[PDB]
Structures are given as C-alpha cells and as structure tokens.
Amino acid sequence: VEPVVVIDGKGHLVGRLASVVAKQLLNGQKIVVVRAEELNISGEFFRNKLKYHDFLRKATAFNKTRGPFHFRAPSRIFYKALRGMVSHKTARGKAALERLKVFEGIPPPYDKKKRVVVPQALRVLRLKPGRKYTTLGKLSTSVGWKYEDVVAKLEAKRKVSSAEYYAKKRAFTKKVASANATAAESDVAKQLAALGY
Amino acid sequence: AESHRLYVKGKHLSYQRSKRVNNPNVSLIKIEGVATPQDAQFYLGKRIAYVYRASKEVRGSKIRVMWGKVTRTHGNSGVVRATFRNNLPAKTFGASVRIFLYPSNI
Amino acid sequence: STDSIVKASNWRLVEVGRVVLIKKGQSAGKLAAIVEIIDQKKVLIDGPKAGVPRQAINLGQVVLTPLTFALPRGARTATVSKKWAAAAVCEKWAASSWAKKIAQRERRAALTDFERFQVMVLRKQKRYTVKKALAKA
Amino acid sequence: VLKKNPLKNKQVLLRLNPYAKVFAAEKLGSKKAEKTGTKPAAVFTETLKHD
Amino acid sequence: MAHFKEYQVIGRRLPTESVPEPKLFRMRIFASNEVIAKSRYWYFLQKLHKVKKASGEIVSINQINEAHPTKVKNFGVWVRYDSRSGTHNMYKEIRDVSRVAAVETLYQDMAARHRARFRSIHILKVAEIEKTADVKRQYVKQFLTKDLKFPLPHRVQKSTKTFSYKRPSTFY
Amino acid sequence: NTLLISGPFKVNGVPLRRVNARYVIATSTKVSVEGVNVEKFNVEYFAKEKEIKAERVEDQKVVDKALIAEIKKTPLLKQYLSASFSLKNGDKPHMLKF
RNA sequence: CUGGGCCAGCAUCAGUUUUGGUGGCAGGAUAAAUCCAUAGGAAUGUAGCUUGCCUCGGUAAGUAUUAUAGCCUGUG
RNA sequence: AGAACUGGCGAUGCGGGAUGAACCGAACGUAGAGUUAAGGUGCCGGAAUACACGCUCAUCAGACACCACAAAAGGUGUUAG
RNA sequence: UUUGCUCCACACAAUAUAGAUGGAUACGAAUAAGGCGUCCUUGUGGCGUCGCUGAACCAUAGCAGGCUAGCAACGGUGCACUUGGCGGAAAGGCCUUGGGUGCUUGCUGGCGAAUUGCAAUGUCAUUUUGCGUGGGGAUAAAUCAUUUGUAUACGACUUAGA
Ligand SMILES: [Mg+2]
Ligand SMILES: [Mg+2]
Ligand SMILES: [Mg+2]
Ligand SMILES: [Mg+2]
Ligand SMILES: [Mg+2]
Ligand SMILES: [Mg+2]
Ligand SMILES: [Mg+2]
Ligand SMILES: [Mg+2]
Ligand SMILES: [Mg+2]
Ligand SMILES: [Mg+2]
Ligand SMILES: [Mg+2]
Ligand SMILES: [Mg+2]
Ligand SMILES: [Mg+2]
Ligand SMILES: [Mg+2]
Ligand SMILES: [Mg+2]
Ligand SMILES: [Mg+2]
Ligand SMILES: [Mg+2]
Ligand SMILES: [Mg+2]
Ligand SMILES: [Mg+2]
Ligand SMILES: [Mg+2]
Ligand SMILES: [Mg+2]
Ligand SMILES: [Mg+2]
Ligand SMILES: [Mg+2]
Ligand SMILES: [Mg+2]
C-alpha cells in the first residue's frame, strides 16, 4: 500500500517483528527497519546473554573462518531472526531479502520520514506486565558491539532537531486551526457535515 | 484525474501447494483491502491481469498481459484463488497484479 | 509546590450500572448495562432499550463506556429499562465524541458515488476560502 | 446417457413420482399441526426438576 | 463432553414375568449430546446396581433447562477424580449463571490444575449455595462484598491492520 | 441483450451506444426518462451495413437535449456525468455503495 | 473483401459443485426465561424511626422487611 | 536369541511422522472439478499472530504417539485440594 | 597507435527491469498511563478536551484530460530563476526572501468528442549502452622489458632510470 514502510523497531519483540517483516518481504513490500537497538527480547538480560553465548561457541572446528558468523550489532542480530524465516538460499529468498534494510539509530534518508509500528510485535502490547525482558543494544555491547554510545550520541542530536521540527509544525497546525475557525462554522461546512465531512 | 485506475491492486503470492508439492495451475492472489473470505466473495469470477514489459514489440506494443479470473476464496483471510489462461511465471511471486470490477452484478 | 501530588489513573470500573458498548456478535454496536458481576472476566449485562438480551457475557467482547447510572445489583430486565430511561443514558451517549464518530463513520460509508463527488466539490469550495485566511495573518 | 437428479430439475422429479405436483400445491412440506392442551402430570415435573 | 447440556436419564431393568414393573432409576447427567448421556447413564448404573444395558432399557431422556438462567449463582461442586497416583474426593465452588455453565469451567479447571481429562472425573453433587457465607472458598467470597467494583488495567485493543501510524495506548 | 447508452454526448462526448450489462456498475442515481423517445433504436439501427450517418448525429441531439434538460434540474449532476470514475487509494469496491 | 479454421465475451440451459439471502412448518417443561397476577421470605437491609458524631449538610451503629430502591422462592 | 494369532515390510509407489523399509492415513491406468484422511494453520510453508478457562518464569524452562531415555529422594517457588 | 576524452541540453537504435499506476503523511516519551489546547510559579503545576484505531489526513471533476470568453480572489499550484539560512550517521536534502511564467474545478458562459462499432489491445515509468549534433571544459599514466635486494620457489614485493 506504501512503496516503502519504515519501522521504528523500538519497543518491539525481536522474533514477532521478525516474523511479520519476513512475510511482508516475500509478498513484495519494501521494508526498512530503524532504531534496531531499542528492539526488545522477552526474558531477563542474563538469559539472552547466555543464549547468545551459546551462539558464540559454535564455529567450524577446522577453520573458524567458515564457521557460523556471529554478528554482534542489533541490526544484524535482528537480521538473523529474519533470515531464519526466509528461504534465503533461493533466488526468491534473496529477492525478498533485498527488499529489506535494518539500521541502528535512524540514519539520514529516513530521519525525516514517517515510521510505523507493528502492534502484534509491540512488547508493551504482547508481553504480560511484570514479565522480565532484554534490550538489544545492551545485549549487543554485552557481546561485543562497538557503537552503542556513538549511536546514542547521534540520536540525542537527531532528537533535538526532530523536536524543534515538531515544535514548529505543531505551531503551524495551530495556525491553520485558527485560520480554519472562520470557515469551521461556515455554510459549506454545514453542507459537508451532512455527508460526514 | 491523477487517478485513472479502474481495478483493485493485487499481489501474486504462491501457486496452490502443500508443504512440498505445488500446483502451478492455480495461483494464490492477495487482494488489497480484503481481510476475510466474506469480502473476497465479491471478486469471485472477476478478471485478473498480470501486466509485464518485454523487448520484442508485438501489437505495436512492448507491454503484454496474462489474463485470468478470480475463481474461489482461500483460507480465512481474504486471500483468493485464480487461474490464468496460461499460468503465472513464479518469478512473479510478490509481483503486482490487477483485479477488475467486471463481470459485475452491482 | 507544597502539596502532596498524586495523579491516580482514573479507569472505567466494572460496577453495577457501568454502561458498556458491545464489541462482537449479534448485539454488536449496541449498549447494555452491567447488572451483576459474575467473576473477574465475566459479567451479567442487559440492554433493554437497544434490544440486547440480558445475558452472561465475557468482559473481553465489551468495552466500558465512561457512563454510569444508578441501579440496584442484579435487577431484572424491567427495572433496568425503568432506571436506564430515568437516567437518560442514550441521551448522554449520543452527545459524546465517541458516539458521534461512530455516526460519522456510518454516514460516510453510506454515501453514493454522486455524494462522494459532491463532497469533493464542496471540500474544494471550502479549501479555497481557507488558504486565503491562512495568508491574511 | 447422463444421470439427472430429481432433487433438481423438476422434469425428472415429476417423471418419477407424479404426486409431487400436488405435494407442492397443498404445501404440506409445511402444514400446521393440530392442537392439544394435554398438560403433564405432577409427578412428571417433580422428578424432572428433582435433585 | 464440550458445550454442555444437562440431562435427566430415567431407566430400569428389563421386566421379568416374575418381576413385571421393575424399579425406575434416575440420574442427572451432563453431556454434550444425548447419546453420550445415555451411555453415561449405564456407566454409572453398572457401578451402583448389578445391571448392564443388554439386560435393561432406558425409559426417558429429558433436558433440564436452568430455571433462572440469568440469575448469578454461587455453586457447590463435589467431585471424585483420578490423579496419576491415587483417586480423590474434592470440593470446589464456582460462581456462574447456570449449572451447565458451571460444570464446563469445572471440567476445564480440573484439566488446568490437576490435569484431569473428562474421562477421569465423576461429578458427585452440584448445588446452589443458598445463603452467602455458606460460601467457603475465598475466590468466590471475594466477589460478594458490598458495592464490588474494580478496574481492568492495561487494555490491549487487538489490531485490524498490521501497521499502525501511532504508538498504542493501554488506558481503559 | 445490450443496453442503450447516451452519455449524453454534449455532456461527456459519449454517443448513443451499445454496451454489455456485465461491464457496467449500476449507480443508485437515476434521471427521469419520460420525455425521451427511444423506441426507434434497436439492433438493426446499429447494424453493420468511417463516415457518420446524419441520422445518428441528429438522433443524438434529439435524445440528448431532453436528457440534458432533465439533468439540469438537479445540481452537480451535469458535472458528475462529465467526470470519469476512478478508484482511489483506500476505495474498497466491496464496500462502496455507488 | 466474405466463407472457413481457431480463439473470446455475453445470453439462455444441461451435469457436477461451492458460497450467500429469504419463506413456511414440527418438536421439547407444547423449550426454559423475560413479562404479568399473586402467596411467602430474606440481606451484600431501600425508606422511615432510634441514639451518639457533624460543618445541622450529612454520618455511624442499631432498628426496621417495601416504604422515598429493589431482589429472592412457590404457584398461576 | 526364540515361539503364538493377526496385520505389515519383503514385492509398494502416494499423503503425514523434518529425516527414515516396517508407525499413522491411504494402496496406484491418463486427466478436470469438488471433498477429505492422517497431519497441520507466527515465519520458513499452503492454512485463524483464531476464540475460551486455567497453569507455568527455569543464571539448564517447555514444546506431541512409534521416538530418538531418565530414577529414588528433596523444595517456606506457585496453584488447587 | 590514427580513432580522442570529459561534463550539461534534447535527438534516434538497441538493451535491461523480483514488478509506478492519487501521496513513504518526519516529535520524543510513558503504557498501573498519555496526546492535544490553554494559563502559569515553566512545574512530578492549574483548568479543558480527546482515544475506544489510518473506516484518518491530504489530494482528487476537464481529448490519458482539448479549444474558447468572463466575474470574483491576491489565493492555490507547477515550472525555470532569485534572497537568506540550516543539514556530515549514508549530510546530496530541508526551510526561507523577491519577482517572472503556465494552470487554476472559487464561480458563469460558448464549442469539441461518435464509427476504436458490446470487453480483448490501454498512461508510459527507468536502466544501462552505443552512436548524432552545439556549447563549455581538461591535455595523463600503468604494464612489458631493463635495474635495486629492506623482497623472492615462480608470480608477487621493494627501489632506480629522460
Ligand atoms: Mg521477544
Ligand atoms: Mg527448501
Ligand atoms: Mg494452497
Ligand atoms: Mg487511565
Ligand atoms: Mg466534457
Ligand atoms: Mg447452473
Ligand atoms: Mg413484578
Ligand atoms: Mg504398508
Ligand atoms: Mg529377496
Ligand atoms: Mg506402503
Ligand atoms: Mg519425529
Ligand atoms: Mg527455515
Ligand atoms: Mg501462509
Ligand atoms: Mg503475535
Ligand atoms: Mg504415551
Ligand atoms: Mg509443590
Ligand atoms: Mg490530561
Ligand atoms: Mg499516544
Ligand atoms: Mg499539567
Ligand atoms: Mg490524521
Ligand atoms: Mg489522446
Ligand atoms: Mg541509506
Ligand atoms: Mg477483458
Ligand atoms: Mg636480501
């Protein structure tokens, strides 16, 4: 329905979000995921730190080079959960995966474009209150990721900018309302009202 | 008239298939806007088109069409089934497709 | 400040006479009253005026409105109708942005093609006179 | 050459069994029952509602 | 065994010239259709009297519709059931509108907690606890207080479409 | 089996024409057709027997001017006829009244 | 240029089928309820009344079974 | 290792059990349309991120017959009795 | 080495395309809480309102959108210019100033359409790549060989030579 759908992956659950995205691609919807480092995972931090360490201990014995590749960034962790749910070894698989981009923080083309959420993957909606969980970016520097502070820094900087953007916009829509008012209660108004508009 | 479209937007998802065997002879279409089988009943029988480009010109045209109609509903969520005169190319899974408002009973 | 400040979430409570909007089923979209509480997940509702039959209903397929009228617990259908009427609950429902939007939604969905056309035009008509306003100050 | 099923196509429905014409005509695929005020004895309801 | 109906089942021994008119026996039976009802009537009868159905007949089978099916009730339920290692008797209460309603949560509740499938459970007696404060199991007494009212924190509206252009609120 | 269509020509350029019911959405607006002759038009009228007959052209005006006469008694109907129909983003045919 | 050959759309049907709308009947505790009449009762006790508390607004305990809410159970 | 009755594999593909002689379903001319079995329906993957009541939080949870194991003994975890 | 080479315009013949067909419409944060409005002591502040979904908002009428005459606005919008600024996470984009120009369905008129015959067949998107013109532009290096030995099985590496 849109050409590209941008997902603020904040507060989402890794594999559920993963799941919807893998289907969205296979059906030909271009997707970019952003803020991949504020992605959630159910279960307390230690468990997932432990779970990851399992993943780590797996490597081709005679040549660790060809072994399973342990990507440590949140984007890449998240991209793992996704690839797992796509038949990536086929052309159809590759094609699907080429419709996908994942980022940590929200880099420049997207920083000024609307993002959406995916309610059936929203942690706050799905998880039962009280149930413990894990933050991805924090999982990642835990197991080696190098750019948690660099992203937070560029994010705080984006957040200033984006909020003055919003302050100004909110101030403009104020105007159009106080422009409108005049015609809010007009005769055409009433006629539109008769039609649900 | 920025809009000129007299059709509903579709995607080509799959051939009909079990876990390990596909039937090329039926295509599973996903009609945009259709959540439930009850809806998808509207479009049954209505003609579909897949429209692709080529290199060799034919009817003075580099654009071609594969035609067929929506034939029965699929599953619980508005996916619907379709047969075409020929059989869609499978490279087209996830391609766009077009579902027209005729044959009509409106 | 020098007061103690405590904002407390102000939920719609399930309580006899809580009036509820029915979400799913044959009595969808209709209002009923909560008459008695079966358990933490289930209540007794009755919707006399709107034609929804006194029944046990799972709380999940209902959404609490912010309305509440006075009702004795477990009151037969009749006195609900008496009480509900007395309180003018329909009247207060209709007055809400919630009740109004539902109406709008249905109105919109009722429009002829020709009517959609007409909205477009008048909307163009209003637009023009707005943009200028949006430029005189 | 071709099996026709009287449960559709009235023609073969009437080929077999002519009485269908009248059956239909007199409705009686409905047909109201009579009417009787015979109420059930006391012991019948006692036991029914018994513990 | 599912959406429950309650049945009266009335049956007797087959008449003998020596005993024309044998005594009639009745059970209340909860089953989903009447075949299972009749079948249950024998199951139990066989364990109480010395009789199998090949030597008896079923006289009547009538559904017992709840008398006041919109009055909320507190139910006493006595049960005999089989665990993996013993068999036991068990009282519990259920607040609901009908007997048929109650029995169904009874049957689910036994599976949830003591992992007892339908087959391994005998329903001893079921009964409307007349005078409140004859209710003993707290998890029903809890609902009996004057002007009982409570909220339903953390609303989770299900979604119709997979993308949402707004961050949801859980506010009821 | 076809349907006689008229446009009308002076409103949206479409002539007195044949059309199959099965490729048409029947809207819920209607114009009175009481003043309109129409009984001369049949199959053989359209019969394949380029240039355009003067009959076709003159018949057009005859039928049209009456319809246009009736159309004008109702506002924005005349415009509505000249506009083309196109589905928009967010139109679901299986819902729309027309 | 017309016939053929092939393809296609519509219409009326035949066979198989899938999916909707709608009419009339039958049964049961001749459903059970709601509803109505009436007898009787209670409390998670409605109004009065009683006594301390009050901001003389109201309130608490206690009395009190329809009253200035209502509910339950029986029969019809 | 060795007998009893029967059904199988061997001689036999098909659908399910990821996989697999033997389980489950079902046996086979060339095909169209329908419906199902056993088994499934978050994504890989065709099919409800369906409905309903509970239960469970594991710094070693658990997740389906044949089947790819776990026991005595313990726990003021938590549930019902 | 004789052909050249580079940027921008618009011009043909190929060639390709995981799939345009009104718009990807920018706070952050919490969810046992929040958005918006408004005032203030600019705060864990006071009042008012909203949700119960985007079933929104915006845009959309004109030969696939023609020709033609006017009123009312002083607006909308497209284009090529122009004044200021901001954007380095991949900023390659964003706001802003001044006219110019086409369109304007805000409104009122005059024309056009057929016969493509009752659906087939219909708007042409953007990649590369070669050739064509008219203008602006720029006027080198790497390898072989020879040589060094901080290098070396051979390739490779490292030096040097107008
Ligand atoms: Mg998770
Ligand atoms: Mg594979
Ligand atoms: Mg299929
Ligand atoms: Mg709240
Ligand atoms: Mg026109
Ligand atoms: Mg037929
Ligand atoms: Mg009464
Ligand atoms: Mg076998
Ligand atoms: Mg052999
Ligand atoms: Mg076999
Ligand atoms: Mg297995
Ligand atoms: Mg996989
Ligand atoms: Mg699927
Ligand atoms: Mg989910
Ligand atoms: Mg076992
Ligand atoms: Mg224990
Ligand atoms: Mg507020
Ligand atoms: Mg919010
Ligand atoms: Mg405040
Ligand atoms: Mg909006
Ligand atoms: Mg043209
Ligand atoms: Mg990028
Ligand atoms: Mg066609
Ligand atoms: Mg050396």
Tab-separated table of C-alpha atoms (C1' of nucleotides) in Angstrom, chain G:
chain	number	residue	atom	x	y	z
G	1	C	C1'	-13.254	-8.264	-49.407
G	2	U	C1'	-16.889	-12.643	-47.435
G	3	G	C1'	-16.610	-18.100	-46.205
G	4	G	C1'	-13.924	-21.327	-43.203
G	5	G	C1'	-10.344	-22.782	-39.210
G	6	C	C1'	-9.317	-21.387	-34.451
G	7	C	C1'	-9.941	-18.332	-30.175
G	8	A	C1'	-13.075	-14.996	-26.898
G	9	G	C1'	-17.247	-12.229	-24.299
G	10	C	C1'	-22.449	-12.236	-23.185
G	11	A	C1'	-27.340	-14.762	-23.029
G	12	U	C1'	-30.431	-18.860	-22.191
G	13	C	C1'	-29.612	-24.157	-20.360
G	14	A	C1'	-27.651	-29.353	-19.141
G	15	G	C1'	-24.089	-32.009	-15.436
G	16	U	C1'	-21.007	-31.717	-11.138
G	17	U	C1'	-20.201	-28.380	-7.288
G	18	U	C1'	-19.063	-24.219	-3.852
G	19	U	C1'	-20.933	-19.811	-1.250
G	20	G	C1'	-24.948	-16.236	0.344
G	21	G	C1'	-30.090	-14.147	1.120
G	22	U	C1'	-35.110	-15.329	2.321
G	23	G	C1'	-40.284	-18.031	3.219
G	24	G	C1'	-43.330	-21.797	5.683
G	25	C	C1'	-43.854	-25.793	9.170
G	26	A	C1'	-42.566	-29.762	13.539
G	27	G	C1'	-40.902	-30.933	18.472
G	28	G	C1'	-39.384	-30.028	23.993
G	29	A	C1'	-41.395	-28.398	30.892
G	30	U	C1'	-46.238	-27.936	23.631
G	31	A	C1'	-38.397	-25.136	25.477
G	32	A	C1'	-36.511	-22.800	29.842
G	33	A	C1'	-36.589	-17.254	30.650
G	34	U	C1'	-38.220	-12.016	30.202
G	35	C	C1'	-43.195	-10.237	31.214
G	36	C	C1'	-47.909	-10.307	34.149
G	37	A	C1'	-51.011	-11.744	38.694
G	38	U	C1'	-50.378	-13.391	43.443
G	39	A	C1'	-48.528	-16.000	48.395
G	40	G	C1'	-44.464	-16.033	51.052
G	41	G	C1'	-39.274	-14.685	52.675
G	42	A	C1'	-34.642	-12.703	53.097
G	43	A	C1'	-29.871	-9.373	53.124
G	44	U	C1'	-24.067	-7.795	50.440
G	45	G	C1'	-31.111	-4.350	54.551
G	46	U	C1'	-34.148	0.730	50.116
G	47	A	C1'	-37.228	4.482	53.136
G	48	G	C1'	-38.582	5.758	57.608
G	49	C	C1'	-37.737	5.588	63.129
G	50	U	C1'	-33.951	5.393	67.367
G	51	U	C1'	-29.010	7.122	69.645
G	52	G	C1'	-24.154	9.286	69.915
G	53	C	C1'	-20.677	12.279	65.629
G	54	C	C1'	-21.222	16.661	62.500
G	55	U	C1'	-19.756	21.637	59.033
G	56	C	C1'	-27.059	20.707	61.368
G	57	G	C1'	-25.246	19.437	55.230
G	58	G	C1'	-24.713	14.874	56.435
G	59	U	C1'	-22.868	10.213	59.122
G	60	A	C1'	-22.285	5.737	62.054
G	61	A	C1'	-24.089	1.869	64.547
G	62	G	C1'	-28.713	-0.204	65.635
G	63	U	C1'	-33.870	-0.828	64.443
G	64	A	C1'	-36.916	-1.644	60.585
G	65	U	C1'	-38.642	-6.283	55.770
G	66	U	C1'	-41.218	-2.008	50.558
G	67	A	C1'	-41.760	2.237	52.496
G	68	U	C1'	-38.848	7.639	49.412
G	69	A	C1'	-34.596	1.195	45.541
G	70	G	C1'	-35.119	-3.426	44.711
G	71	C	C1'	-34.062	-8.794	44.966
G	72	C	C1'	-35.226	-13.891	46.065
G	73	U	C1'	-38.528	-18.515	46.254
G	74	G	C1'	-43.518	-21.039	45.286
G	75	U	C1'	-47.841	-21.393	42.443
G	76	G	C1'	-50.765	-19.410	38.446
